[PDB]
Amino acid sequence: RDEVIKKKNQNEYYRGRTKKLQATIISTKEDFLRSQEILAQTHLPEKSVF
Amino acid sequence: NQEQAIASYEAAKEELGLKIEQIAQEAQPIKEQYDSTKLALVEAQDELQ
Amino acid sequence: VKSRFEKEKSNQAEAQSNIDQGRKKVDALNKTIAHLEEELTKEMGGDK
Amino acid sequence: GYTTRDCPQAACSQVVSMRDFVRDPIMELRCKIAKMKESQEQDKRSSQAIDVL
Known about the structure:
This is part of a larger assembly, with 1 copy of chain A, 2 copies of chain B and 1 copy of chain D.
Chain A: H1 2-35
Chain B: H1 2-48
Chain D: H1 25-52
């Protein structure tokens, strides 16, 4: 019984970690939206500089 | 940046190590008091029977 | 108190495994930056 | 506030005291089972939101 209640506590901690991962993927989606401005090589390098 | 991240991770790891050392040196009195109060009254139930 | 100790030691072991994964990552990155330094020496960067 | 107070619900005109009430564990069992089911469905919804994102 002690083992199963401690593993339930560990599962609750894993759910909290999953919520933290949800926050992190939200932040990464925000970073994706930010890079959507200049992400696809908007500043093309010079062709014949050499 | 991953180097500074792993450095912060090592700092958190040593902080957690100090914390677990503290809670280990602090929980032993609680455990010994628990087992002492348990064994002292089990014999009480035995002598009651 | 034993649940506190167990959760603390479990997240400590998790941090230790994360430190091991970070060591793997930093040695892989050392290998890749050595490869990039070889590429730079071939392209005559810091060499010049 | 009153030494003899009837139940708020109808169909029972008799007064109910403190000794008349009994602790029925089935009710709290059902409430906590419903709470556990709600937490489980919330966890399922969060996991599905994780998958679709």
